[PDB]
Structure formats: structure tokens, C-alpha cells
Paper text:
Copper-containing nitrite reductases (CuNIRs) catalyze transformation of nitrite to nitric oxide, which has impacts on geochemical, agricultural, and medical health fields. CuNIRs typically have an ∼110 kDa homotrimeric structure, like a Reuleaux triangle. Each protomer contains one type 1 copper (T1Cu) and one type 2 copper (T2Cu) site. The Cys residue forms a peptide-bond bridge (Cys-His bridge) together with one of the His ligands at the T2Cu site to transfer the electron to the catalytic T2Cu site, which is coordinated by three His residues and an axial water molecule.
Numbering used by the authors:
A (entry chain A), B (entry chain A), C (entry chain A): 16 to 315
Write the structure that this text describes.
């Protein structure tokens, strides 16, 4: 399971590069790179990543934007690729491999609003996803969501699993060793974290008493479904996959398939710390608990 | 996995205490207690329970009721707590531990209609849920459900798993040993049972030919999702989490996350016995089959 | 796990027999038979089947049709039966066993539109399903689907698992050895395949650039849920269980319970080959990837 050319390799994170190039066109450049991430205290995973993050950096575009995407493969020996669930594309032409030390550019439209998974598409896809090559792209709906004016504060959360290192038998046949949440920044000052068992417990997300919170969520897997629940509240409104039409109300828990997304909104009525879980409690026990700290001011 | 102070302990079930104290206020008193339950024939589980039942006793309130909840902890050594998924509360103030031989009182509103899980909230939550500290609270919608006038008969069903006794490794990493249904009484004469592999086979729920049946259902887990199905019928109407807005029709099978609820309604057209399953058939084989006996009169 | 009377038995497939006998009445005759199926290259499973296919042959009826169903049991020693999820029936009278070398006839209505599982109902049901006795019945809605006029081409896909041969311990407690797709023909010229790891990769489904494709899908299990996703597109419209009322839009991935169905519709915008997966990637790795080849003409 050890790739000789990855020994000792720890490529420092590289910032996502994005720039708008027209009213409906956006350039995005990512890397594929090999980066050590502390997934549990004392446990380093030499992850296969986009940009040195796992899950990868957040991408946000508008409905109707065409994405001109470049992948720069920094892995010395493994090809990598990109599949955005947001886009309409030819997989065999547009989600193809970029060889080590090369770049590739691929263009495709994001026609549909929502909270989409992205991930590496190189065979075996399970191997590339499980080693860390997953993330979220949000496509903002042209006309918003009907409840936009009620939302006071918003964050992005992503659920993923971690297995035994680069172990295809475990990836296929074993239970996850860890299941984790991470948060990816939407506005300056938001946290930006990797999938680990501890950061969002020790540095909770912050909010203020009485606020309606929106979370953009996706369960990237690779393998498990998620029973997403915020303790001490009920979801006022849920939009499955973030499409405004798929509108549920008053859900205690949102069932997410592997790669499933949602926009969920809830009110926090009292000061305190509110756990955020997958209610599949074996997974929660193995790391998948984040915290939301609600104060009279909204500051820690 | 054996707690010395639980040896030989078998605390007889204690009735739930509920009383309305105002037009929108209700007192509820439960216990936390250690009680032997026969989960399969010849198999005793010394369960951690509310009130000596696992799942615990049914709670029914109205939308807009504030619950003034008291937990009396009869466990000689383990703290326990209560988390109602129905309520808006501060988890770190209102879902806190009650020490052995003590009581605690916590007040919070049930603002949202539906079929909610409740459970102990004491760390490790997986341990407390898996050992039996789960249940359902139903919050009745102020304006009912649109199909109320069509329903002839109704029952509550709950799905849960059982693992190796108090074994955190198994709870986290193992398949369930048993998966089971129980029924909790809504009206005098309804059965009231615990999560076991046999009672609802040997003493089926009863109905009459031609009736529309409503089931209030919740899959409390701890770990598995449920593929809820009634053999020989199709769900005419489904309300996800019991919120009247989340209205599906003509479903063969309802996907429930861990902690997921629903109101489901179906018509039984012919005399006979109708199995009720999770269609994840490994779980059905390990206990999760209940029976509905439909007769020309509705009596056995 | 070896049944002596099945040694060397390989009953050649028998065609489904269907004929309409009135404006709202249809005769269907199936067999139960024991047939060797190559589920992975070099791996034969001596399946328990309807008609020598696993999943079994496709059945299509109209909403409001009463089905007069005959099962001819060709198994020399095991009883078999039939449960259609489409129908309202008495399970203990209408889904009963047919003994070896006998036939039984059962009549029941299909009142509800959708994409329903069918399967053998003989105890242990897990054993009969896992050994291959599953399939789909489609009930066409009297008034169609609102998007009917947009659909250019349609196919049926079914997901199932395969375990160690006739091994009840594995069926209950083990991970699937294979997870697979098959396609069942709706119109002359459509492929008709069994649940295997390779046929729909080597002989992809065919379509033409720009088309809107409808898939009628069901995850028959026995045990797993499915995270159904088409690479390179987004589902424009989804009807859960194939009921026109259960209408979602813009889903990346559709969560299917065990026995869950859907009608899903999506547009393929560019020439190429488009994988079709369960996004639970351990299952995809173990076989559950089909291909859709999209050409400028629609022919290979
Ligand atoms: Cl919880
Ligand atoms: Cl069934
Ligand atoms: Cl994919
Ligand atoms: Cu414009
Ligand atoms: Cu450290
Ligand atoms: Cu990769
Ligand atoms: Cu994907
Ligand atoms: Cu698992
Ligand atoms: Cu506000
Ligand atoms: Cu809430
Ligand atoms: Cu009042
Ligand atoms: Cu006994
Ligand atoms: Cu407890
Ligand atoms: Cu909970
Ligand atoms: Cu399991
Ligand atoms: Cu009636
Ligand atoms: Cu029905
Ligand atoms: Cu007619
Ligand atoms: Cu061969
Ligand atoms: Cu059979
Ligand atoms: Cu079934
Ligand atoms: Cu599995
Ligand atoms: Cu067209
Ligand atoms: Cu699409």
C-alpha cells in the first residue's frame, strides 16, 4: 500500500485560484498533490488531495456559469482528474487524466443550482476518493431560495470517511476507521478546515442566540450514507441537493446518500453548544461530531 | 463490559407520568433504570432504559406544548440525560446529566409536528443509545394531516438494533446481532412492547378488512438506516418526519435515516396476515419483521 | 450450503409469458428455476431464479390492471412463491408457496403507478432473494408523467448484490462480494441482461447526443441502499418510486432504500461514455458501474 515515490512527500497546500472572466464564465485552477493531514490526534494520513486540503477547497459559482477548469498534477507518479457533479460534460473527454507534472484544461457548464460533490475520476475511483480527493462545489441559484431573507448566518460542512492508509481491501470491505466533518469558508473570517475528528469540537462554529443558520452540506463518502442532525433544533427548511424546488420542512434528520447534498436551515433559540452529528452513531463515535457555539453576541 | 454495580440489578418497570398543566404546558417524568429485557428467545439484555422499557415509553404532546421534563436517575453508578428531537433547547444546559440517585428538571418547547426520536445524551452517546436509551415522542399537528378523515386505525412502531452486551467495539465496528420492531400504545387496548425479535410475530397488530391504517414510525438506530415496507400493500400517503408538508404518495418503501420518522398510511384489502419489514433483508432475518393480522371483524 | 438435488442442475432460461385478457386484466406466467449465471468473469452462481434470469424478467402493466399470475415451480426440492410490491394482496393467501413440480395461480390488482420490486416470498426470504429471486414490475401511470413529451429514449436498470453461494451467515452478516447492474428490455432491440459486473461495461447502453434519457430504476438489494448517480449529468426530474406526485428536480444522486424505485431523467449533452454508478464507491468497485455510450447517431 506504500507508493515508493510518495515516501517523505508532503507538498505544502497551494491556494485555489479562481477568477471571473465573463458574466457567465469562470476560471478555476486546482492542483493534485500529496499532503500529510492529521485526521485524528497523533494520526497522519498522507492524503491524495486537491490543493493540499481534504476535502478540497470550496468552489462557489453562479447558476449558468461555464467553468474553465485547469488541474495541475503535482503527484510525482499517479495520474489524477476532476469530476464535478455540478456540470454537464462528456466524462470520457472532459473528466480525463492529467499525468504527473502536467496540466489539463476542461470546460463545462454548471446549469443547475445546488450543493454538489466534486472528486477525482481516475480509476480506481474508490482509491482516489478514499485517499482524499473529494470536495464541494456550490452553484448559487439565480433566484435564490425562498427563505433567503430569513437566514442570518451560513456555513459549509462536509462529511467524509477515512480508512486504513491506501488499502484497497479495507476501502472495499472494511468499516471506516474515522468519519469526520470539515468546514470550508464562504466569507472572510469563516474557518477552513480538513476532515478530522477534533477541529470543529475544539474550535466550534460560532453563532448568536436567536439566529437562523443555513448549512450547505454534502456527504462525500466514499462509502457511507449520512443521517444529518443538529442537536437542540429542528430543520425549519431543507432543500435536497440545494435545488430550491426540493423543499421539505420540519425535518429532524436529513438522509444523504453518498455524494448527497442539501441546504438546511434551523433556528438556535438559547445560548449553549449544539452538537452537529451524523445520527448513525457508530460514525459519530468515530469522529463525526462538530460543534456550534451559540452566544449572546456571536463571538467566542 | 460488565459494570460491577449493575450485577444482579433488574429494576422493575415504572410507569411514565404525564399531566397537562396548562393549555400549552405539559409535565413529564421519566426514570433512567437498569432492566432485564428478553430481546430474543433465551437472550436477556440488561438494558439501560427509560422507565424499564426499550425503546422507552411513548410520549404524545400537541404542537406548541412546552414540556417540563424530569428525569429521575435510578442507575446506581452511571449518569443519564434526555435529548428530545422534538424540542428547541440548549444542549449544554438542557440535555445535561443527572447523577445517580438524583433528579433533574428541564423545560423546552415542542414547536414542530412529527414523529421524533428521543434518547439519552450522555457521553458516549452511542453507548447509551445502543444499551437501550431511545424512544419516540409524537407531536400532534395543530391542524392535523390532510388525510386524517380517511384513517380507520393507527399504531406506533419503532425499529432498533441490539449488539453484543455493552461492547463499545461491537457498537462501533460490528454488525447488529438483532434488529427489531416494537409497538407503543396510543389508545387503551393497544399493545405496548419492547424491541424484541418475536412479540409482534406471535401477537400481531390487529386490523379489519378494508381499513386504512396509519403507522407512526421511527428508526432509532443506533447505527442502521431502515427501508420500511408493509407486504401486500403500498403506502397511499407518507409524511416524512410526520410533518404534514413533506407529503409523498404511492411509495412501496420509505427510506428512514437513523433517527428518521414518518407517518405512513396504507389500505389492507383482504383478510390475512401482512408482514411489516425493513427491506434490508439481513436485518429482517435478524428479527425486524412484525405482523399485522387483518380479519373480517378486527378482533383476533 | 450445497443442496444435493441442485448438483449439476442448470435449467435453461424460459421466456416470460404475458397476455392481456381484458381492458384491465393481464395473465402472467413465470417459472421458478435453478440456472447457472456468470456474475463476474470466471464466477458462476447457481442462482435461484424466475425464468432463468437474475434479476428476473421485466413485467410491465398499466395502472388499474389486475394480474392473474401463475408460478410454475421447476426447482426439484425447494418451494418458491411471488410477492409483487405493486399489488394489494393478502400475503398469507396470495403470496404462498408453490411446491416443486407444481403450479399456483394468484390474482391481485396493481392500483398504483411506479417501479416496483418483485421477489420470492418463501421463508427465509433473505435466502430466496439473495440467491437471485428478485426483479421489477413497472406499472404505467394512466396519465403518464408530466415530462413524458421531453423524453427521447428510455431503459430499465436494476441494482442487486451477490454473496457467497447460498451462505446464510454471509447473507446476514457479511459484506457483498459483488454489487451489480442489469438492464431489462422495454422495446425490441433493447438489451436484456443479468446482474453481473461486466456486461453493461463491455456493451454499454446506447444514446444520441442531446437526448433526454429516462431510466426506470430499482435497487432490489437484498441488503444495501443505493446512491444512484449518472456521471457527467444531473437528474432534471426524479419521481420517487415512479409515482408522478413524488417529483424532485435537479438531483445529483438519488437515495434508494432496499427495494426502492425511481423514474429518473437526465440530458446527455456531449458525445462520450458516461458511467452509471452507485456512489457508495465500495459497491461500485465491486461491480456496480454500467456505461452509457452517447454518439452523434445513437448507434454503436
Ligand atoms: Cl443526537
Ligand atoms: Cl417484502
Ligand atoms: Cl461519480
Ligand atoms: Cu447574462
Ligand atoms: Cu498532532
Ligand atoms: Cu486522483
Ligand atoms: Cu461522483
Ligand atoms: Cu459501514
Ligand atoms: Cu433572524
Ligand atoms: Cu429547529
Ligand atoms: Cu392557546
Ligand atoms: Cu424466554
Ligand atoms: Cu444514559
Ligand atoms: Cu439525537
Ligand atoms: Cu450494518
Ligand atoms: Cu376506511
Ligand atoms: Cu397499499
Ligand atoms: Cu376501463
Ligand atoms: Cu466466463
Ligand atoms: Cu424462492
Ligand atoms: Cu418485498
Ligand atoms: Cu454493506
Ligand atoms: Cu430531446
Ligand atoms: Cu443532468
Amino acid at each position: 500500500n506504500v507508493i515508493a515515490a510518495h515516501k517523505g512527500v508532503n507538498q505544502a497546500p497551494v491556494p485555489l485560484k479562481m477568477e471571473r472572466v465573463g458574466p457567465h464564465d469562470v476560471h478555476i485552477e486546482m492542483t493534485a498533490q500529496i499532503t500529510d493531514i492529521e485526521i485524528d490526534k497523533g494520526k497522519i494520513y498522507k492524503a491524495w488531495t486537491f490543493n493540499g486540503q481534504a476535502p478540497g477547497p470550496l468552489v462557489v459559482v453562479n447558476e449558468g456559469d461555464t467553468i474553465h477548469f485547469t488541474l495541475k498534477n503535482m503527484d510525482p507518479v499517479v495520474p489524477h482528474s476532476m469530476n464535478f457533479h455540478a456540470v454537464h460534460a462528456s466524462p470520457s473527454k472532459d473528466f480525463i487524466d492529467v499525468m504527473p507534472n502536467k496540466s489539463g484544461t476542461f470546460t463545462y457548464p454548471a446549469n443547475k443550482p445546488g450543493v454538489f460533490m466534486y472528486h477525482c475520476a481516475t480509476k480506481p475511483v474508490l482509491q482516489h476518493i478514499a485517499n482524499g480527493m473529494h470536495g464541494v462545489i456550490i452553484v448559487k441559484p439565480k433566484n435564490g431560495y425562498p427563505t433567503d431573507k430569513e437566514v442570518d448566518r451560513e456555513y459549509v460542512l462536509i462529511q467524509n470517511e477515512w480508512y486504513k492508509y491506501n488499502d484497497m481491501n479495507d476501502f472495499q470491505n472494511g468499516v471506516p476507521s474515522y468519519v469526520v466533518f470539515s468546514s470550508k469558508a464562504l466569507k472572510p473570517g469563516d474557518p477552513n478546515t480538513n476532515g478530522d475528528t477534533f477541529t470543529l469540537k475544539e474550535k466550534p462554529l460560532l453563532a448568536k442566540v436567536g439566529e437562523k443558520i443555513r448549512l450547505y452540506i454534502n456527504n462525500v463518502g466514499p462509502n457511507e450514507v449520512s443521517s444529518f442532525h443538529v442537536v437542540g433544533t429542528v430543520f425549519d427548511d431543507v432543500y435536497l441537493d440545494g435545488n430550491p424546488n426540493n423543499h421539505l420542512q420540519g425535518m429532524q434528520t436529513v438522509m444523504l446518500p453518498a455524494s448527497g447534498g442539501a441546504v438546511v436551515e434551523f433556528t438556535v433559540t438559547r445560548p449553549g453548544t449544539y452538537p452537529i452529528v451524523t445520527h448513525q452513531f457508530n460514525h459519530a463515535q468515530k469522529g463525526a461530531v462538530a460543534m456550534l457555539k451559540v452566544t449572546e453576541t456571536g463571538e467566542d
